[PDB]
Design a protein around this ligand. Sequence first.
Ligand SMILES: *[C@@H]1O[C@H](CO)[C@@H](O)[C@H](O)[C@H]1NC(C)=O
Ligand SMILES: *[C@@H]1O[C@H](CO)[C@@H](O)[C@H](O)[C@H]1NC(C)=O
Ligand SMILES: *[C@@H]1O[C@H](CO)[C@@H](O)[C@H](O)[C@H]1NC(C)=O
Ligand SMILES: *[C@@H]1O[C@H](CO)[C@@H](O)[C@H](O)[C@H]1NC(C)=O
Ligand SMILES: *[C@@H]1O[C@H](CO)[C@@H](O)[C@H](O)[C@H]1NC(C)=O
Ligand SMILES: *[C@@H]1O[C@H](CO)[C@@H](O)[C@H](O)[C@H]1NC(C)=O
Ligand SMILES: *[C@@H]1O[C@H](CO)[C@@H](O)[C@H](O)[C@H]1NC(C)=O
Ligand SMILES: *[C@@H]1O[C@H](CO)[C@@H](O)[C@H](O)[C@H]1NC(C)=O
Ligand SMILES: *[C@@H]1O[C@H](CO)[C@@H](O)[C@H](O)[C@H]1NC(C)=O
Ligand SMILES: *[C@@H]1O[C@H](CO)[C@@H](O)[C@H](O)[C@H]1NC(C)=O
Ligand SMILES: *[C@@H]1O[C@H](CO)[C@@H](O)[C@H](O)[C@H]1NC(C)=O
Ligand SMILES: *[C@@H]1O[C@H](CO)[C@@H](O)[C@H](O)[C@H]1NC(C)=O
Ligand SMILES: *[C@@H]1O[C@H](CO)[C@@H](O)[C@H](O)[C@H]1NC(C)=O
Ligand SMILES: *[C@@H]1O[C@H](CO)[C@@H](O)[C@H](O)[C@H]1NC(C)=O
Ligand SMILES: *[C@@H]1O[C@H](CO)[C@@H](O)[C@H](O)[C@H]1NC(C)=O
Ligand SMILES: *[C@@H]1O[C@H](CO)[C@@H](O)[C@H](O)[C@H]1NC(C)=O
Ligand SMILES: *[C@@H]1O[C@H](CO)[C@@H](O)[C@H](O)[C@H]1NC(C)=O
Ligand SMILES: *[C@@H]1O[C@H](CO)[C@@H](O)[C@H](O)[C@H]1NC(C)=O
Lengths: 249, 249, 249, 200, 200, 200
Amino acid sequence: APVIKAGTATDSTEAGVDNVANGVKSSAFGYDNKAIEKESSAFGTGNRATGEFSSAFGFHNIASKIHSSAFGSNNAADGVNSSAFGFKNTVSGFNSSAFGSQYQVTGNFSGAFGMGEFNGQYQYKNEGNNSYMIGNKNKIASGSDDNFILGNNVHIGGGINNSVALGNNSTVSASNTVSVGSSTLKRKIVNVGDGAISANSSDAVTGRQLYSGNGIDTAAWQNKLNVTRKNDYKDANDIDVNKWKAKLG
Amino acid sequence: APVIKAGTATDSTEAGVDNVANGVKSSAFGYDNKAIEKESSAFGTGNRATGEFSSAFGFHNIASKIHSSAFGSNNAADGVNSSAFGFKNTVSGFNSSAFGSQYQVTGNFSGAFGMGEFNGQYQYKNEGNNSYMIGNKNKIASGSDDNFILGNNVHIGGGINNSVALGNNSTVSASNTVSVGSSTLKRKIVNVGDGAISANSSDAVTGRQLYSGNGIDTAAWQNKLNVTRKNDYKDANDIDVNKWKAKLG
Amino acid sequence: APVIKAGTATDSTEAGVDNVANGVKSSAFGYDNKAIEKESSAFGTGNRATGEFSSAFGFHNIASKIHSSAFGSNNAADGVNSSAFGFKNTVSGFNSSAFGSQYQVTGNFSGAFGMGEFNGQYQYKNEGNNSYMIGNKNKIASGSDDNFILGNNVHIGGGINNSVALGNNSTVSASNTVSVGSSTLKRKIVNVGDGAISANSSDAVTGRQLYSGNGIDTAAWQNKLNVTRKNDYKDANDIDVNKWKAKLG
Amino acid sequence: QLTTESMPFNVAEGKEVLLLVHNLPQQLFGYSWYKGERVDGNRQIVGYAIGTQQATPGPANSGRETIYPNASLLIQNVTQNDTGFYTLQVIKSDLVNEEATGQFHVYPELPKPSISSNNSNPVEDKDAVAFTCEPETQDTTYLWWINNQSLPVSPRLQLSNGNRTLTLLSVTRNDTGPYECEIQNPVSANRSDPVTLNVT
Amino acid sequence: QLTTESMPFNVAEGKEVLLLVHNLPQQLFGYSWYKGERVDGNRQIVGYAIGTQQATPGPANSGRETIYPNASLLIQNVTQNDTGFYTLQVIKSDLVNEEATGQFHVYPELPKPSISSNNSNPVEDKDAVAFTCEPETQDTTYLWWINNQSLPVSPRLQLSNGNRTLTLLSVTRNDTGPYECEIQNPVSANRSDPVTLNVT
Amino acid sequence: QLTTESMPFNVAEGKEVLLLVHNLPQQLFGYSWYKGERVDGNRQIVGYAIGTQQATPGPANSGRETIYPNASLLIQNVTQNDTGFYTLQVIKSDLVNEEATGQFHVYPELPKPSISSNNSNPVEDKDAVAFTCEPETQDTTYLWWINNQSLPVSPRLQLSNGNRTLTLLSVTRNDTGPYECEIQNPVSANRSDPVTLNVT
Ligand SMILES: *[C@@H]1O[C@H](CO)[C@@H](O)[C@H](O)[C@H]1NC(C)=O
Ligand SMILES: *[C@@H]1O[C@H](CO)[C@@H](O)[C@H](O)[C@H]1NC(C)=O
Ligand SMILES: *[C@@H]1O[C@H](CO)[C@@H](O)[C@H](O)[C@H]1NC(C)=O
Ligand SMILES: *[C@@H]1O[C@H](CO)[C@@H](O)[C@H](O)[C@H]1NC(C)=O
Ligand SMILES: *[C@@H]1O[C@H](CO)[C@@H](O)[C@H](O)[C@H]1NC(C)=O
Ligand SMILES: *[C@@H]1O[C@H](CO)[C@@H](O)[C@H](O)[C@H]1NC(C)=O
Ligand SMILES: *[C@@H]1O[C@H](CO)[C@@H](O)[C@H](O)[C@H]1NC(C)=O
Ligand SMILES: *[C@@H]1O[C@H](CO)[C@@H](O)[C@H](O)[C@H]1NC(C)=O
Ligand SMILES: *[C@@H]1O[C@H](CO)[C@@H](O)[C@H](O)[C@H]1NC(C)=O
Ligand SMILES: *[C@@H]1O[C@H](CO)[C@@H](O)[C@H](O)[C@H]1NC(C)=O
Ligand SMILES: *[C@@H]1O[C@H](CO)[C@@H](O)[C@H](O)[C@H]1NC(C)=O
Ligand SMILES: *[C@@H]1O[C@H](CO)[C@@H](O)[C@H](O)[C@H]1NC(C)=O
Ligand SMILES: *[C@@H]1O[C@H](CO)[C@@H](O)[C@H](O)[C@H]1NC(C)=O
Ligand SMILES: *[C@@H]1O[C@H](CO)[C@@H](O)[C@H](O)[C@H]1NC(C)=O
Ligand SMILES: *[C@@H]1O[C@H](CO)[C@@H](O)[C@H](O)[C@H]1NC(C)=O
Ligand SMILES: *[C@@H]1O[C@H](CO)[C@@H](O)[C@H](O)[C@H]1NC(C)=O
Ligand SMILES: *[C@@H]1O[C@H](CO)[C@@H](O)[C@H](O)[C@H]1NC(C)=O
Ligand SMILES: *[C@@H]1O[C@H](CO)[C@@H](O)[C@H](O)[C@H]1NC(C)=O
């Protein structure tokens, strides 16, 4: 029968059946819960809180570091100030978070929000630092940092930093780029405001801007294309006289 | 008075007042909690855990499937490996997640992070598969899949796949497009790196690139615009001689 | 020794050691937990639930309003229908959420997903309404609303509305803009579909479109550049006669 | 207890009806009005959210329905198709739903009626002439008026087809007067043209 | 109890081997096959996920391995490097792992052998000529066939270097016959050329 | 117990002051220094975060303050406006705040003073001439010096305006000597030019 009793440390509480509480001011409530560190809490079924100030709430959750939260089902938060929320999320980095299902985050100050895959091991993981993924089945290789993904099936290889991937099945192939598609599917960017055609502006021109061409360098373009200006074509400027007289008598 | 006692199944725990635990290795801690399936836990006030390995922690939470987490207030996670975290979040899809307030996710492998609206029914819901919305009051119609939203008041209609919406009050009207604004508000894209003007490059040209025109096809442009190259003008190439002699004597 | 007993209100439960339950149908489970409002739950170690229907689960969590959830470590959800999940997250807004570590959200209907910084005070906070941040160490000043950030080290000043920032170290300097970089680092946009060159289209032209120039206004461009069409140059159209006959004899 | 009251209960076609709400709970989260006795998401007419103070029309909305902060529902341009039950859903602060119901009937603008007789010249000594109001419409009430006075009940005054048809078993020359009939519903009624008897 | 069975246990090089699984638990979450006796992420060959019904190759995959819905693993183009232990990881519905193991041996295609004599013309009255099959291979079994019948065990028939060398201590003219030796491994066996004795 | 100690307690203007921290807890999460006796977010000078090892200035920072890894605060180019209380916030591993206070005084560098007399020619037999050090300054200590030895206490040596005005009640020709005034503060002190009497 369930019982309430003190654990093996001062102010340690065991509530339920087959509970173990070993840390000072720790508590294990439920069935088969273990709270082994100081001020650690394990509430639910089969949870393990093996780090100080760590809490595992739910079903078969594991928290292992100085401030770890594993809330949900089969989450493993093994990282300082790390949080694993959802279903079967493993966070192994420092100050990293993960929300969703079957996602692993081994990078530092990284995050993931979506669904990955776990057959017997995590097939899609976040191994980059300061990188975030929102989508399904996304990969970031180790050594690729400061990368952001908003899409599905986006795999980032090694040595790709400061990159953003947007949309389903997007592809990143270089650093300091924003990708809105792959070599097979290319997306249009619609509803773009007019650019700032000028010498030094870094904007995005639109269809109407290039259609009309307002604000272009009328002098630079007249050198790249050898343009006979109508003013000269009217005033006979810059012609040969020993040559025109030949064909024209 | 609150009591600790066994439930109706082996290793089932009831802690508190008016609790019911019916699953094997289940536990209901708090007030008016029901845990009816194997290894299901309901901790808090008025929670219901009606699925195996499901946990409902908080206030009036409902978990109904084989791995369901409803953490917060009035969350209903009715979906396999589905998580509903926050306030009044309903997840009805497979492996789908939701964090925030008053959001519903009926799609498969979908997610929502933000605030919706619930007067008596969910007014803003994610009904698309493999789709994610981050923002306030966002809608994705059923049959529109692989869509991503980063903005507020973005409604996606039927038959719109592989689309990305960015910013407040953005509008998506077609598939395989990235939308930056609506027909009324059009945003500029600033701080864009120089493109790769060439025969096959798919980049985004900037204001300076269109201003100077470096790297354009100097031969193709000279056919679309019937220019008269200064070399031919200065050397009388490509002229008529039988009728130029007429006007010029 | 731990004890199970009634609180100071009807159907109020205290489980553990040194617990206080004062609200009707409230419960405090663990060590040093206080549940002071009606139907409020405090499960874990040192949690405080001072608002109705509020739940604080974890370690040193505080919930203070009518529907508040503080799940994790040292979270403070002081806001109506607000949720603070993770490590040391403070949500002070209305219907706002925060997931991650050391992030503060004081705006209304706002959110943050990432890591900030907390030395003795929150150094990076979300002070804008209807604004969302995903990344590390991002700032939104008060009065700047409807802003979205996908990146790190992005600080948004005052009076900047309807803006989107993408990528690491991005910079926003105006309203109704989308920024993909700063004045120092500028990102390219790759894999862009072909635009819709026309009179009124608002698209993004690509490198090939500007290279070939197909679909441009062949008549408008021929006025801005004073080209001499071969149809006239070969045909002697539009020339002076009193002046050509002078130099050409 | 939550109760709703139609105002008025019977509405003429094309008019408006207002459903009042009484004993509304103290702490509330929002309201919703559903068409029919059930609360189904497909039948939601309109919904209010006190928190953000927004009134969002539902799938069953037709543009004629407005919700009010004190939970009353106003339906303008009412039609005969609207006759039915309406349920109000009230969500309290703890988000436990409370339910009520209300109904009203829509009736048409009953027009000018007319009368007919199958014998134009009653025989003075005796005849069995019948009187009937032709313009048949549903769920009305019929009553007859003779000599500007309600008909005197007698077996001599036979009624058939319910009592839209008035048959006079045995006429007399002393019965000459204006015959005039009414067709009447809970919302309106106005009179026909007097019909005389021909004797000599 | 989870048991795996190789089929066949011994496979010729370049053939295929199929690992069967028995007593598979009723409620499952997915499978995974690892090379070696350990379960390590670096050794994962292939993995299946029943939920999404997807088979994903692992880092140890070489393109020759396919997993089946009934947890079976098929390896095509088997090579001598594949000989070893394989472990199957079964993840039940509650996500508690269950482990099993299986193994198979790969053997090469042994050719015709050949025989040599260190004395070409045995002396009729007596000689000590030795017979040896030259083409040395590992882990094989040899056996000698004389007058195409199995060699009669006798101290007169000496065997050296295991029994790959057959030495005849004292030959006689009556021993003239076809000498012929075999090599056999668990997977195959086939013959050399008969060798005769020269006497007069 | 957390204690802070200013070093030095009194600082001349434009110099630097270093606040030491003693008995710092073993397990820490970060520090913060606030101006004034209160801990307010608007008064934060600087903060340190041991985890990420970042030192972030606060709203009250002026560019003259640096935080050391051992929680000491260094303030360079100090001004008279900085005189006040400072509080140190220490956040332990469990994130329970611990507070301590410290203070220092800023004083100006006082110059050469100067002396004045109302009577240039004291009368030899007797006079009541008064000496005064004119350059008035706040919170400082005044010291007189006669024939380079400290003034001998006597009712003869009257003092006025506190003791910046020295009145000689009944002068004599034997009182002739150098008269010199000293203006000193907690941080500095230097002297004036000796003054003499005129007698004959
Ligand atoms: C609700 O609002 C309308 C307009 O203010 C009003 O006519 C109606 O009486 C109100 N209901 C009640 C019960 O007062
Ligand atoms: C009322 O209903 C009829 C039928 O739709 C329509 O023609 C009429 O314009 C409506 N009047 C108003 C004020 O809506
Ligand atoms: C009165 O009679 C006229 C003629 O048919 C009809 O149009 C009208 O609806 C009637 N009004 C009422 C109140 O019965
Ligand atoms: C018509 O009036 C005559 C008068 O004699 C009567 O006989 C007859 O019953 C009436 N017919 C009908 C159908 O009421
Ligand atoms: C008699 O005639 C008038 C209309 O002509 C009618 O209004 C009145 O009601 C009738 N008399 C009585 C008592 O009803
Ligand atoms: C006429 O018909 C209705 C049918 O319900 C009846 O109530 C009413 O009394 C009848 N009037 C006479 C005079 O029969
Ligand atoms: C598994 O599938 C393969 C092909 O269908 C089959 O050959 C094998 O017999 C199956 N294993 C079992 C134990 O049935
Ligand atoms: C089998 O393996 C050998 C060596 O890699 C290769 O040459 C051969 O083509 C393979 N055959 C098949 C059917 O895979
Ligand atoms: C037979 O010998 C040949 C070549 O000498 C070899 O390729 C083959 O594997 C052998 N077959 C068997 C069944 O031993
Ligand atoms: C070679 O053959 C002769 C036959 O007499 C025998 O004596 C001898 O042992 C053989 N040598 C070897 C190495 O077998
Ligand atoms: C003897 O003859 C043939 C070889 O030609 C062989 O196949 C057969 O098996 C031999 N007899 C026995 C018992 O092996
Ligand atoms: C030949 O060597 C093997 C070694 O295991 C042995 O098993 C076999 O019995 C031997 N045969 C003879 C005839 O010695
Ligand atoms: C604190 O750090 C600085 C830098 O080394 C040092 O000058 C100071 O003495 C340190 N204080 C103590 C008590 O060690
Ligand atoms: C100190 O402050 C004064 C006035 O602000 C300034 O002139 C001086 O340059 C400063 N000295 C240093 C070393 O910063
Ligand atoms: C000495 O007086 C001078 C100016 O007269 C001043 O600059 C200085 O600060 C003083 N130094 C001390 C130690 O009092
Ligand atoms: C000025 O000096 C004279 C000397 O006789 C003395 O009488 C007088 O008190 C002094 N007055 C002041 C204001 O010091
Ligand atoms: C006497 O003379 C010198 C200055 O001339 C001074 O430094 C010294 O301290 C004086 N002696 C005393 C006891 O003050
Ligand atoms: C000079 O002024 C201060 C004021 O506190 C006093 O302490 C000191 O004793 C005075 N010196 C004499 C000789 O009076």
